[PDB]
Amino acid sequence: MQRGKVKWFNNEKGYGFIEVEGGSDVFVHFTAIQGEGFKTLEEGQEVSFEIVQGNRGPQAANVVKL
Amino acid sequence: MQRGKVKWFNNEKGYGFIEVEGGSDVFVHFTAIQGEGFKTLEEGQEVSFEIVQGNRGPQAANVVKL
Ligand code: NA
Ligand code: NA
């Protein structure tokens, strides 16, 4: 588990990337976003998350807005 | 998606396992469950999901109640 900030998120498409200090960007799909409310992220938002490997490569899991 | 059936799920602990045909049971955490509902599953529940590899091995992502 670790923290990062949303790099960008296309609200219409429901995905974007988390930027990591000193690391590679991490793909994030809306289905990973925790909490209640419309599943979205905004550029700059700090998040905690886990990295998992799926068929398309690394992606975020358990994305909590801080 | 992959299909399976919930073997058990403990809604106090927030986890359980999904049984899948021809393979090992897959760990499922409440944070993977989709829907604005309460994030719980019940024994026997048919689901669609994705298997991803996390730091503890295979686990469920994107768990949708069918
Ligand atoms: Na970076
Ligand atoms: Na099995």
What domain range includes position A5? 1-66
Instruction: Say which of B36, B50, B54 has its CB closest to residue A50.
Output: B54
> For residue A49, what are its two tokens?
């998350």
Degrees to nearest 5, angle at CA B6 with A62 and B45? 105
Rounded distance from Cα A18 to ligand 1 centre (Å): 9
Give how many domains chain A has, as a whole number: 1
Helix (H) or strand (E) holding A19: strand A15-19
Q: Method used for this model?
A: X-ray
- Contact criterion met (CB < 8 Å) for A54 and B55: no
Q: Resolution in angstroms for this experimental structure?
A: 1.2
Cα separation, A63 vs B14, whole angstroms: 17
Q: Look at B61 and A54 and tell me if their CB atoms are within 8 Å.
A: yes
Phi, psi of B65 (to 5 degrees): -75, 125
- Whole-angstrom Cα distance, residue B5 to residue B62? 14
CA of residue B57 relative to chain centroid, distance: 14
Rounded Cα distance between A46 and A15, Å, is 16
In chain A, which residues have their Cβ closer than 8 Å to the Cβ of B62? 31
| CATH number for A6 | 2.40.50.140
